[PDB]
């Protein structure tokens, strides 16, 4: 594990978020004001940590001893530092849309949003609930508790091994694929929260990895760490090709899918499917004319089986 968190540890990141914020208030950035919005996420995080801190009144060093939280505070300083190092080591090219240091900022924005979700799900009301966490899918629940008990968080390697025993992982490159599908906070730890989001998105547990294989590894329409505005912008190029669609993880309704597609009246709509697995949304969308050409490609995966 990583070091003790004291009160002086937290003043550190508060100062670092401050520097991130002021850096993000640059007119030149022309920072769209929509989820994930770094300029809210950061204040909200601090806000939530005040909450956690104000509740660990006095016993402020039972908290200092929390593993998950010690990992979190670490990652947090880490991520905020990276971010600061982009504005430095990337100088001017922050400012062209579709440039490295600017997509990386979106990625970072994204991770930041995953962090706050993870935290809030582990500390609802600001008071630790990691080990009493309800996992959503019956069968995923079974696996986790029967492999990690009431642990909130494991290291990646640990998780990989455990998973492999039940759902073998074809290869090292695949493992690596999986690792960045599931490590939403990019911390080389898998948390119970992280695990639930993956297991919801890729049900039934029974065929978990086969599912993930068909919907993400081998699927032209899957998009990785992509935001809503990014989906609108990407599908611009197919505006004259209705049926063109992509899809991704919803950022605000974490654990759910967000399909984006071009209509015959020529707008670009986005839905969160409900009460169907993703498989069937996509099959029906094909069958019904709405989801025909993934990311523009004429060729569309057969999933009926």
């Amino acid at each position: 594990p990583p070091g003790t968190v004291d009160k002086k540890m937290v003043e550190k990141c508060w100062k670092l978020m401050d520097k991130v914020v002021r850096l993000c208030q640059n007119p030149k950035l022309a920072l769209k004001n929509s989820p994930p919005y770094i300029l809210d996420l950061l204040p909200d995080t601090y806000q939530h940590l005040r909450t956690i801190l104000s509740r660990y009144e006095g016993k402020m060093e039972t908290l200092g001893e929390n593993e998950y939280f010690r990992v979190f505070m670490e990652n947090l300083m880490k991520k905020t530092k990276q971010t600061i190092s982009l504005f430095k080591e990337g100088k001017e090219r922050m400012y062209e849309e579709n440039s490295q240091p600017r997509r990386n900022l979106t990625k970072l924005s994204l991770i930041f949003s995953h962090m706050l979700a993870e935290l809030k799900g582990i500390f609802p009301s600001g008071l630790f609930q990691g080990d009493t966490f309800r996992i959503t899918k019956a069968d995923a629940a079974e696996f986790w508790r029967k492999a990690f008990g009431e642990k909130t968080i494991v290291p990646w390697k640990s998780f990989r091994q455990a998973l492999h025993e039940v759902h073998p992982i074809s290869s090292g490159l695949e493992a690596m694929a999986l690792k960045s599908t599931i490590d939403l906070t990019c911390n080389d730890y898998i948390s119970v929260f992280e695990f639930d989001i993956f297991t919801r998105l890729f049900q039934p547990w029974s065929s978990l990895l086969r599912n993930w294989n068909s919907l993400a590894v081998t699927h032209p329409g899957y998009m990785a760490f992509l935001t809503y505005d990014e989906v609108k912008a990407r599908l611009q190029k197919f505006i004259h090709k209705p049926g063109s669609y992509i899809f991704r993880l919803s950022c605000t309704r974490l654990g759910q899918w967000a399909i984006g597609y071009v209509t015959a009246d020529g707008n670009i709509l986005q839905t969160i499917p409900h009460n169907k697995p993703l498989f069937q949304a996509l099959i029906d969308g094909f069958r019904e004319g709405f989801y025909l050409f993934p990311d523009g490609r004429n060729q569309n995966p057969d999933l009926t089986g």
Binding site: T263, Q270, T271, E288
Partner: peptide, 5 residues
């Protein structure tokens, strides 16, 4: 987000 097609 908007209703499924």
């Amino acid at each position: 987000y908007t209703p499924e097609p």
